[PDB]
Amino acid sequence: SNKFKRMLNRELTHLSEMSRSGNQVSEYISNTFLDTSISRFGVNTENEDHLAKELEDLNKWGLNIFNVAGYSHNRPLTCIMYAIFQERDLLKTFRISSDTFITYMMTLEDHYHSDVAYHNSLHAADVAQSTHVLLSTPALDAVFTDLEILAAIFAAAIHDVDHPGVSNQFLINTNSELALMYNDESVLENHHLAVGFKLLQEEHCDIFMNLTKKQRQTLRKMVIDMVLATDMSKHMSLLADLKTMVETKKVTSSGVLLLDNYTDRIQVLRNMVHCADLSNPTKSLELYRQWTDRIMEEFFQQGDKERERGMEISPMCDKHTASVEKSQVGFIDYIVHPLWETWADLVQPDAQDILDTLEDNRNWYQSMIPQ
Amino acid sequence: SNKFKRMLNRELTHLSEMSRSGNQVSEYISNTFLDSISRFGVNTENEDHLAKELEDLNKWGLNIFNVAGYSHNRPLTCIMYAIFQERDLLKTFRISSDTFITYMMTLEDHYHSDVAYHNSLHAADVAQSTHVLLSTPALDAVFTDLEILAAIFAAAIHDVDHPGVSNQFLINTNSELALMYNDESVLENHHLAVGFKLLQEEHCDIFMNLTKKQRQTLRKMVIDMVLATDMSKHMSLLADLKTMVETKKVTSSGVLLLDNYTDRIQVLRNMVHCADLSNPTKSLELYRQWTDRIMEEFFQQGDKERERGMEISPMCDKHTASVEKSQVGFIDYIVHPLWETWADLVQPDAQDILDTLEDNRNWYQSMIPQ
Numbered sequence: 217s218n219k220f221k222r223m224l225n226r227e228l229t230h231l232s233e234m235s236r237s238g239n240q241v242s243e244y245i246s247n248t249f250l251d252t253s254i255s256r257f258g259v260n261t262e263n264e265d266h267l268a269k270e271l272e273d274l275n276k277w278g279l280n281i282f283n284v285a286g287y288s289h290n291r292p293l294t295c296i297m298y299a300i301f302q303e304r305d306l307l308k309t310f311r312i313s314s315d316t317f318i319t320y321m322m323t324l325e326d327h328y329h330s331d332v333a334y335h336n337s338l339h340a341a342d343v344a345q346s347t348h349v350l351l352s353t354p355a356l357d358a359v360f361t362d363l364e365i366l367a368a369i370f371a372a373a374i375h376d377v378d379h380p381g382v383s384n385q386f387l388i389n390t391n392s393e394l395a396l397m398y399n400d401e402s403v404l405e406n407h408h409l410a411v412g413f414k415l416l417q418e419e420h421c422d423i424f425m426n427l428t429k430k431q432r433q434t435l436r437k438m439v440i441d442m443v444l445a446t447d448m449s450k451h452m453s454l455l456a457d458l459k460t461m462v463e464t465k466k467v468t469s470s471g472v473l474l475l476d477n478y479t480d481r482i483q484v485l486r487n488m489v490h491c492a493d494l495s496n497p498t499k500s501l502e503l504y505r506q507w508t509d510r511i512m513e514e515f516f517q518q519g520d521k522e523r524e525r526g527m528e529i530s531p532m533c534d535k536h537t538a539s540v541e542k543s544q545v546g547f548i549d550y551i552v553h554p555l556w557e558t559w560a561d562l563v564q565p566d567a568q569d570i571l572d573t574l575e576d577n578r579n580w581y582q583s584m585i586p587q
Numbered sequence: 588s589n590k591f592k593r594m595l596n597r598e599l600t601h602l603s604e605m606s607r608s609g610n611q612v613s614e615y616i617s618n619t620f621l622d623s624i625s626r627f628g629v630n631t632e633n634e635d636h637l638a639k640e641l642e643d644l645n646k647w648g649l650n651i652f653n654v655a656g657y658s659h660n661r662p663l664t665c666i667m668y669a670i671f672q673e674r675d676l677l678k679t680f681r682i683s684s685d686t687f688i689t690y691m692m693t694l695e696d697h698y699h700s701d702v703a704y705h706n707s708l709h710a711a712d713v714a715q716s717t718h719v720l721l722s723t724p725a726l727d728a729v730f731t732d733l734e735i736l737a738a739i740f741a742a743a744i745h746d747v748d749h750p751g752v753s754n755q756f757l758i759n760t761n762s763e764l765a766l767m768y769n770d771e772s773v774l775e776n777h778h779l780a781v782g783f784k785l786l787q788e789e790h791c792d793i794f795m796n797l798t799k800k801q802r803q804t805l806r807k808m809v810i811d812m813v814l815a816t817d818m819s820k821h822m823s824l825l826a827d828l829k830t831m832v833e834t835k836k837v838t839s840s841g842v843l844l845l846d847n848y849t850d851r852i853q854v855l856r857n858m859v860h861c862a863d864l865s866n867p868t869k870s871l872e873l874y875r876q877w878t879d880r881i882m883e884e885f886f887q888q889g890d891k892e893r894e895r896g897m898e899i900s901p902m903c904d905k906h907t908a909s910v911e912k913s914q915v916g917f918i919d920y921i922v923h924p925l926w927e928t929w930a931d932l933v934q935p936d937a938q939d940i941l942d943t944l945e946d947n948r949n950w951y952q953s954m955i956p957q
């Protein structure tokens with residue numbers, strides 16, 4: 217659609233001229249978004265009661281994933297994934313032993329880096345838990361098969377495995393081996409998928425051993441589609457497709473969405489995990505503020521690596537010139553809010569408290585803008 | 588004193604036999620503690636917000652995180668220029684704003700931003716706390732300006748170029764730095780070298796206008812103070828501070844009597860040491876943030892150790908921490924004893940500092956699980 221494209225670049229030109237704040241946010245958007253305990257929980261802990269209290273939020277959008285990390289000896293991913301699989305009865309359905317499951321989930325957690333401020337197992341655990349809540353949205357809850365539920369949640373788990381804490385564009389600009397291996401197109405996301413699936417081959421880790429061949433093939437395609445869709449530069453095209461889907465949606469009976477073909481189904485799932493990935497500003501302000509401070513830490517360190525190298529500092533990576541408050545407002549106004557508004561429309565009446573929390577958070581960061 | 592060494596050994600033995608948790612805290616202790624531009628010095632357009640945070644310059648409660656926030660992440664440059672304006676040190680030592688900001692920016696730039704705790708934020712915190720501690724009524728008339736300058740500069744540079752790993756990791760991994768300094772005070776020697784080496788940069792010689800004798804005395808005092816921040820020297824500094832307390836003299840205006848260089852430097856080095864260990868004495872919002880940072884830095888070191896197939900040093904294993912219990916041990920066995928001794932030396936001064944420590948301690952105990 218040339219109209220949407222013409223409209224997009226208009227919206228960003230105007231922002232780019234509002235102020236130097238808007239220029240830095242507008243440069244960022246274009247370069248980013250455009251093309252008993254070990255079996256009770258998955259984990260050893262002598263805090264079984266504090267952990268059991270936190271995990272009562274398993275199905276709530278307000279689950280505090282930071283506290284889970286605290287009471288799980290810093291295994292928020294293994295712990296949450298075990299909880300989701302118990303909750304949805306996925307181990308039994310797919311004949312996965314708890315043993316194989318925990319060994320895989322520990323190996324996966326281990327390949328997330330804890331020295332990366334944001335793209336580490338905590339973020340993986342949050343995105344997986346948020347996907348778990350989203351899959352229970354009433355308009356979809358009856359729609360997806362368990363194979364699709366498994367694919368989505370696994371997708372979420374692995375979606376950033378082995379992330380180094382720098383962007384696809386830095387990896388291309390520094391001529392990384394990874395950029396070289398994947399020919400500059402979706403560098404990290406291809407890698408996340410490779411690692412996640414490669415790890416099944418490790419000893420006692422094939423959590424899909426007991427699926428049929430046709431099941432494995434369907435899972436793998438679904439998962440590849442979802443993770444490649446977390447590539448941020450695909451954001452505008454994903455939102456375009458979601459909007460056209462809203463305007464031509466079919467409700468069946470009792471509020472449920474009609475998704476006949478594979479295309480319709482994967483489009484929704486991949487927007488779902490994409491939404492999970494951008495759910496930080498829709499969570500409670502305590503949660504959201506921690507996430508912001510982490511991503512900025514990570515952007516700033518990329519900025520220093522650029523500076524060490526004599527490269528030009530990327531937008532939002534200069535610690536000496538960021539405006540974190542104005543940037544958050546822009547990010548909500550121009551990316552998070554449009555995406556979540558469209559999602560709310562697809563799945564109405566759901567997502568509305570999510571949308572209201574999003575405005576509170578946005579208004580809090582506005583209230584904190586000096587001058 | 589052999590009876591101090593025996594007593595010290597006794598309490599740590601009792602501690603490690605208490606439980607798994609006390610074992611690990613006791614292993615830790617033994618391995619660690621025994622042997623716009625015109626106005627603020629930074630360019631910001633948050634001149635109002637920054638000015639308000641900086642009204643706490645002379646208070647224990649200053650929030651250095653917010654200062655970082657309003658100073659475009661130049662907390663050290665900003666705080667140091669505030670302290671130096673406050674005490675009129677730039678005029679007194681004829682240091683120009685150009686020379687001073689250029690040095691301070693260069694110094695701040697050599698603290699690593701990718702290190703969770705030992706960055707310019709911690710340096711700025713320790714600098715501001717030294718500044719507050721130097722105004723303790725019992726000492727406040729005692730020290731000359733050269734001594735004040737040394738102590739504050741010492742604090743500024745005390746961890747510059749810290750790589751986020753411990754003296755023992757550097758020895759165990761055969762670091763070039765451990766090779767250079769022969770396994771003794773590796774980082775602290777390095778911090779001093781860098782801090783002084785940086786005066787030689789273009790427009791950075793902030794001590795250019797001091798006399799030779801002044802430069803010589805300042806350098807001796809600074810070296811003394813920074814080597815003193817070596818954690819492995821903790822117990823012998825405390826032992827000295829305790830025998831200082833028991834043999835203390837006071838003029839009458841409530842002011843301590845410090846004639847010789849030895850008693851003077853002994854206070855100055857316990858002061859910066861106490862500033863370095865002040866996190867748990869601060870308000871709870873601040874201390875929580877510091878704990879989380881130092882724990883991140885230990886955990887990363889632990890992963891580097893695991894990446895190398897070494898055994899994971901105490902407190903560096905992310906899968907076997909008990910942060911809450913560890914903070915309570917830290918306070919009972921290291922922070923509280925030190926500050927209690929400090930409070931005695933300078934009484935009635937450090938008494939709320941000390942009550943805050945109790946509050947913080949008890950909050951961390953109230954969060955211990957089960």
Ligand SMILES: O=[N+]([O-])c1cccc(-c2cc(Cc3ccncc3)cc3cccnc23)c1
Nearest residue numbers: 241244248448496507508511532543546547
């Ligand atoms: O101006 N902004 O739009 C702007 C400014 C500062 C931060 C962000 C931002 C991007 C992303 C998604 C993401 C993650 C990793 N790489 C790229 C994008 C996630 C975020 C989560 C919390 C806070 N900020 C975020 C956006």
Ligand SMILES: O=[N+]([O-])c1cccc(-c2cc(Cc3ccncc3)cc3cccnc23)c1
Nearest residue numbers: 612615818866877878881902913914916917
């Ligand atoms: O139980 N503990 O003793 C224990 C457990 C966990 C953390 C600490 C700890 C040590 C040091 C001083 C330090 C800084 C850098 N390297 C070595 C020591 C400073 C701290 C500041 C805030 C919180 N914990 C700290 C102590």
Ligand SMILES: [Mg+2]
Nearest residue numbers: 375376446447
């Ligand atoms: Mg990603």
Ligand SMILES: [Mg+2]
Nearest residue numbers: 745746816817
């Ligand atoms: Mg140090």
Ligand SMILES: [Zn+2]
Nearest residue numbers: 343375376493
């Ligand atoms: Zn992600």
Ligand SMILES: [Zn+2]
Nearest residue numbers: 713745746863
């Ligand atoms: Zn220090």
